[PDB]
Design an enzyme around this catalytic site. Structure first.
Site, PDB file in Angstrom:
ATOM      1  N   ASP A 474      29.176  87.708  19.201  1.00  0.00           N
ATOM      2  CA  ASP A 474      28.172  88.749  19.046  1.00  0.00           C
ATOM      3  C   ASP A 474      26.844  88.112  18.640  1.00  0.00           C
ATOM      4  O   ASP A 474      26.781  86.896  18.418  1.00  0.00           O
ATOM      5  CB  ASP A 474      28.715  89.859  18.147  1.00  0.00           C
ATOM      6  CG  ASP A 474      27.977  91.183  18.253  1.00  0.00           C
ATOM      7  OD1 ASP A 474      27.075  91.328  19.138  1.00  0.00           O
ATOM      8  OD2 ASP A 474      28.297  92.066  17.448  1.00  0.00           O
ATOM      9  N   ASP A 543      27.213  99.191  23.345  1.00  0.00           N
ATOM     10  CA  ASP A 543      27.762  99.816  22.140  1.00  0.00           C
ATOM     11  C   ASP A 543      27.957 101.318  22.362  1.00  0.00           C
ATOM     12  O   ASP A 543      28.621 101.976  21.571  1.00  0.00           O
ATOM     13  CB  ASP A 543      26.892  99.612  20.882  1.00  0.00           C
ATOM     14  CG  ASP A 543      27.038  98.252  20.208  1.00  0.00           C
ATOM     15  OD1 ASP A 543      28.036  97.554  20.504  1.00  0.00           O
ATOM     16  OD2 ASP A 543      26.137  97.871  19.421  1.00  0.00           O
TER      17      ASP A 543
END
Lengths: 722, 229, 246, 722
Positions: A474, A543
């Site tokens: 990430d 997301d």
């Protein structure tokens, strides 16, 4: 040799499958003669007609008809009379005027690319045109490379700039690809959007002036993809010429289209000039990232196929590009930072019951990471929280039948961390300025070789000492406060050097641990580009896990990239980003147009919902080869105005079609939905009703699509060719 | 005084005939509150709503809702969290990060303009807002000027950058005017064209990304006019 | 011409300043000269409209809007050139046929009317003209001496825009009691109903006397009903309506 | 049998080459199941889903889901619950409600069509579906016919209505073809325009409501063509589905598109309801004109090709459809009414010098015709004016090497004529109303059988007693003042009966004199339709002979009709319609994209201009096969906004391209013009420069098109494939 490189008198032919670049050497000047479908024995029917154009200047006093303002070129300079945006610009002595002249051409066979940047693989059946240019006064060399592919309508390009002088020189602009196209009507397609809206497909007319997309965020970004499609007027899904230019780079880029005073059109893609300068001491050199030019005459579907194929065969790691990806569970939306051992193993239990294959432990397992305000940089297992060693958690998971996955964020450092306490100077910062914070964290300076060495060591340790099957990598903020250089010039290099550091780190780790599936991430799709996809065969596309919000996102995310790359997860309702209730059926069908996982607390589900999940997992195990390995056909596009989405996949004897409708309608005739690319004479048996339809019926008459009343309903048609 | 310059608490009003620029000082940051038809006793019906926007960074660790990525401004910097194209960018020492903060405002009456560049005349009935900004670490001053006209719906602007440090500094970008407008549907009109086709009127929809006209010819040029509607 | 080959600085930085310093030098030069000789009319030029901006127009009250002096090619050029800048600035010249840029024959009437929507001059060999053409020029000059205040000092209203697709151009000027309208049609048309052309910014109750026919129209009629615009067959024809408010 | 008619249970398959109509019999109701590309073993993937739709009524009390308001049909009635525009409507007793139910189907082989109306020929390899419908209460039969073609993607249709009752009935509406298409996005293309602007190509989006084109002028008219193309959204020249519906009729027609409340779309074409009623006594019947439905999936060029091919093979007379047409001179614009023998023979002399093949004597040779105010109806040779018998003029012309042609206007009568003096009642008129005049002439009532008999006799006499090689058949006004019937109903039949009279007359004459080339005319293109083109293999496309004004006219005039049909003449400057000067080169090249003739006073030309004409005639003799017999490809369309026109013709080893630019441009990059439908590997030698280009280069790179400064310039590229 139908394909490869050829040098015939003053013409260079770069010949990929169904795509040629024909360049003429004209007294040291390189002219773009044709880029498009294959032409042999090119004569010059489409040559620029040499006229005196007002204010278009000349290299010699006496010939007014030859101007670099009016010739079509493959690279652009400023100060020689061409006033279109330049793509190479180098400061030396008191000037940034260069005059690179062609001196010599060579042809390479096979593997070839810039050092330390991601580039194509599986290059046995390629040739590379090497065009050697020199500015004799500046004592500089510019070398251009163009690489053919025998199995794809793509050409790859990059350049090397050598300083052969006795002084320092500074690169200000160095793009990876440029093309001058003839005056005609054009449209452009790009992928833009926003966080939680990634890769929004934008189409517009080319207009006089300059249009650009760019990132100055130190990552490619959520809001722009390193891609630009120059299309013939009126291009459709099925018909028309498209040229896609793309960049295998994950830092600051620019793509531009310039329509000049004569109606001519220049396109280019490369490292953004913003936040970039590059010092070369004597004998030093610079190589640009790889750009790709891809061509179809079969419209937007055709360019999708060309781009996906090329990515699958020459960018995405061979080890994974045709490997079915595990169906995973991820605890993130499921528990956030608030978990411990009991809860994890309970989730794992439930995940196994429903046939999930892989368990991903997300943020919060390391150092002091109880929220998102600290601990980044301290990659030390929190054994209290995991109820023991990470080793013992992994075994626990392996024993329950699940592969094990783990979230990292290596590029980041919290102020409140042992790392920041030992080394505050490792953060990207400017002396005498306060930090700019983002999600209350800082960015590690991966231009600092000690930072890269440390991350290699810490992560090699992690991966060697633990039986980890999967990594989620990430990256949750953009780069601010550039000032870590010892000089201004070193700061201006910092952003590209950061990228070289990332690539050194991730190429090292993915190579030393090739059995692990690495999934890239940056608050979802914040860095979803072909740079990252050289190393990470899968990406967390967004997301936003809303089934409906996902439709335009998946449209974009698979536009140029294969579906296999495109992480998609069934999540809880009401959805956390959108605030919306959606049918579990629709969340299921939408995620199954991608690379399927689950991101919700399975322990809090009813027995029914658990049973639904297990059926979904059983369905996808069947669908996975068709979706991940098959050919994708967009049937109805979820754009700004459409109330619908439909995507088809073909794979040998299997054809599937998913249909989603966003808003409920009334007194509206049912949609007719026609399938693509079947055998007219083929017999296709529809699973739900047992009926057998010829391909011609399915393609030419289509399906009456029927739905009850309600929002966000979906259905799937499954066909077996008999 | 229907027209001229006014300073009321943290609001600056630049008031030409039928055209106002209303700027708020927010702890050293200058916010564009309104540009358009005359408003007195402005309250802030159209203020930006401060939200946490993903990847829009912050000057302080603990307030995620204030970001120069999301505030509407009258000048643009790079490196402080705003990622829109900047309009002032200055190299000093090892960086081209500045952080200009508002320190003080003054009002001039009458004739005023940059030295050695063409500027408005017949300025008896004008006032000029002088917004004095400093980057204390870089030891630089940026001064913004906005001038009202009592007989036209026009405002004029320019800036002065002072180097108050002990070292050479280098200006890389310095635009003369910037405005952040609220999200809405827009079209743009420009004058482009070519030699023997000057000032061709072009109209198009504003699209995500960046559109520009420019000259690098050392004159404004036949093919673009310094104008954007 | 435009600037190439930047490298006169003693350092790179001085070269990078050279282009703006060039401009400061120009402005110092031209502000000096226009100030020390304020009685002279300075007209700016750069192969026509190569530098027609508000920088130059601070010093040069007039500009040569384009080297293209074709009456028809001029229509889109004058549209643009007066879009943000006053008509008084906009140099426009009646030139010879066939036109040197476009290769085209245009009526001397139309070259006349088009140039008179700007700041009128002549750019052709008057010594090679017939007696008729000389007489036409003198009439044009007499007409413009009348029209000059309305065109140069009055308010301009675009009525039909010569854009990419339009076959027409019409511009109106108001100045006290005087209203003029010029109409140009580019290509000849057939079996096409005549254009209706409505004027702007008149007094509804005003009485407007049209010179050509002597008829008196209220402003409301001219604004709300408009003029049936009549033309013979042919390319590049034009006409002018002149009104006096009574 | 890949093609023909098939009856399989309740499905009827009408199968032309690459085009099927699939009809289902549903308890007496006929449903349109599919119209489009070939489908065998059709199952019904695209069936209408039967729902209760509010206010959509039902044939039975208890089934709310079946409604003729919501079913897709092939003919439309009013009063049974379908509220879309009807296509059959018959008054009987106190009602105009019919309820036609399918009773029986038959299949015919070969030649078949309505009596006394133009219909397809060369029908050996066709089959016809005969669908027999009855309204048992009204005692009426409606029979529908659908005909396949084995060599074209076209189906032809018409109907017969029989009165089997004991009372008079009256037809109010009877269209020739209808189709209900599924709700989708559509565009329509039609040919509209005006006198001197014929066949202007119009494209627009289909919108809710009704769009129509129609003629109530008693001829099809200058301003609308009996054609309507229903196109898939975003159709191009090269790609997309198109359905063209067309009518072989030259009277009052209507074409309509209706988008109803559900988004469904109905298209129909037929005799206009306006100015039409049809009385049937017991046992009498009515047959409608033939409609055609033609299909392509290759965009607008593909529908052009389909339509042209069908016209060439099955409509245009076999004797001429592949015969090169003579290059003619016509004296009309050349002298108007003011000519005599000396002038004619002088023109003929000059025409022969320049290689013209045929001499057409236009208006003014008959009765007292010194202007356009008298003499129509008196087809008696004016020997004073022709300096002797027409026989001696013809021999004079034959002897100078030229074929002989003659202008007629049979359908018209001047007030000032011996005809009107003997028979004032033969004019179309209303008792007690003054005439409506048009070009100061009246229309003969061709519904009056004595008028038809007289015209047959007078014209048979003319053609038998004179060695005439060519006829121009003109018609210079529209029909007003309908009132010649003995009853209102007979007046309402008058307009269609006029047409039947015309067709009887012209089919008789073209048959009894098949060696003569008949060219149709109506103030140019006032009646240019497929009705006339069954009898007249050529048409005067427009009175506007301006080279530039012709561009949009020829675009339209050859859109659905072959180029061979399209009369085009080089005329004098300044042009008489437009008031414009054009290069003789451009007038030449524009007319040579059509069927070439000359219409100017050759005796008043300079020696240069004469030499130019002779060269043009020499060029066209070469080009004629390519233009008249070859395949046409539009490359740049002269539409409303374009500054350009380009058309290509291919014919065996020959490829030609004509380029025209309307307005001069400056500082504009030259056009790049790509050719179509060549062999990639073919070698094409360009005549002007001797250069040899592969087809791939010509198609994929194209020609830089170069021109001097100036208006209305043109050029031609000629290629030989080696």
């Amino acid at each position: 040799s139908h394909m490869g490189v050829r040098i015939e008198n003053n013409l260079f032919y770069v010949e990929s499958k169904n795509l040629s670049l024909i360049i003429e050497n004209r007294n040291g000047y390189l002219l773009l003669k044709h880029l498009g479908k294959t032409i042999k024995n090119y004569k010059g029917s489409n040559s620029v007609y040499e006229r005196d154009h007002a204010f278009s200047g000349n290299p010699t006093a006496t010939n007014r008809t030859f101007s670099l303002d009016t010739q079509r070129q493959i690279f652009g300079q400023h100060g020689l009379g061409d006033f279109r945006k330049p793509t190479i610009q180098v400061q030396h002595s008191v000037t940034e005027v260069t005059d690179f002249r062609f001196v010599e051409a060579k042809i390479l066979k096979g593997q070839n690319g810039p050092q330390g940047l991601p580039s194509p693989h599986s290059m046995d059946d390629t040739e590379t045109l090497v065009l050697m240019l020199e500015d004799s006064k500046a004592q500089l060399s510019l070398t251009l490379y163009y690489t053919t592919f025998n199995n794809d309508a793509t050409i790859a390009s990059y350049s090397k700039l050598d300083n052969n002088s006795n002084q320092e020189v500074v690169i200000h602009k160095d793009f990876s690809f440029m093309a001058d196209f003839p005056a005609a009507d054009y449209e452009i397609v790009t992928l833009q959007g926003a966080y939680a809206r990634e890769k929004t497909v934008r189409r517009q007319q080319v207009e006089q002036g300059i249009f650009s997309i760019s990132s100055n965020r130190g990552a490619s970004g959520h809001a722009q993809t390193p891609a630009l499609l120059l299309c013939e007027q009126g291009v459709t899904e099925d018909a028309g010429n498209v040229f896609a230019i793309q960049l295998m780079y994950s830092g600051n880029f620019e793509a531009f289209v310039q329509k000049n005073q004569l109606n001519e059109v220049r396109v280019a893609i490369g490292i953004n000039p913003e936040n970039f300068s590059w010092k070369l001491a004597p004998e030093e050199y610079f190589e640009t990232p790889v750009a790709l030019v891809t061509h179809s005459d079969q419209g937007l579907t055709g360019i999708s196929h060309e781009s996906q194929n090329f990515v699958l065969k020459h960018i995405m790691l061979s080890e994974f590009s045709k490997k079915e990806r595990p169906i995973l569970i991820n605890n993130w939306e499921a528990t956030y930072f608030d978990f411990q051992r009991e809860k994890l193993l309970e989730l794992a239990d439930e995940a196994k019951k429903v046939g999930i294959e892989l368990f991903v432990l997300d943020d919060g397992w390391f150092g002091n990471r109880f929220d998102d305000n600290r601990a980044l940089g301290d990659w030390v297992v929190n054994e209290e929280k995991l109820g023991g060693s990470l080793e013992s958690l992994i075994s626990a998971i392996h024993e329950r039948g699940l592969q094990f996955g783990l979230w990292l964020e290596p590029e980041m450092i919290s102020v409140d961390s042992d790392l920041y306490r030992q080394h505050p100077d490792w953060a990207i910062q400017v002396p005498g300025y306060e930090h700019t914070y983002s999600r209350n964290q800082l960015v590690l300076n991966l231009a600092n070789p000690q930072v890269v060495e440390y991350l290699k060591s810490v992560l090699d340790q992690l991966l060697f000492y633990h039986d980890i099957d999967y990594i989620k990598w990430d990256m949750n903020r953009n780069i601010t406060k550039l000032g870590n250089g010892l000089t201004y010039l070193e700061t201006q290099m910092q952003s590209h050097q950061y990228m070289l550091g990332l690539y050194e780190l991730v190429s090292y780790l993915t190579e030393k641990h090739s059995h692990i599936l690495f999934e890239s991430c940056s608050g979802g799709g914040g860095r979803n580009d072909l740079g990252m996809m050289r190393y990470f065969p899968q990406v967390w596309a967004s997301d936003n896990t809303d089934a409906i919000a996902r439709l335009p996102i998946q449209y974009g995310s698979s536009y140029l990239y294969p579906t296999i790359s495109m992480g998609a997860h069934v999540s809880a309702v009401p959805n956390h980003q959108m605030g919306r209730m959606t049918p579990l059926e629709t969340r299921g069908l939408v995620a199954m147009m991608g690379n399927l996982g689950y991101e919700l607390d399975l322990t809090n589900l009813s027995d029914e919902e658990k049973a639904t999940i297990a059926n979904q997992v059983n369905l996808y195990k069947e669908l996975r080869p068709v979706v991940q390995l098959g050919q994708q056909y967009r049937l109805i596009n979820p754009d700004t105005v459409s109330n619908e989405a439909a995507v088809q996949f073909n794979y040998g004897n299997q054809t599937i079609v998913t249909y989603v409708r966003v808003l409920s309608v009334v007194e509206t005739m049912e949609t007719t939905l026609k399938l693509k690319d079947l055998d007219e004479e083929g017999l296709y048996k529809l699973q739900e009703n047992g009926e057998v339809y010829s391909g011609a019926e399915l393609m030419y008459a289509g399906l009456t699509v029927i739905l009850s009343q309600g929002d966000f309903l979906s259905r799937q048609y499954i066909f077996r060719k008999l």
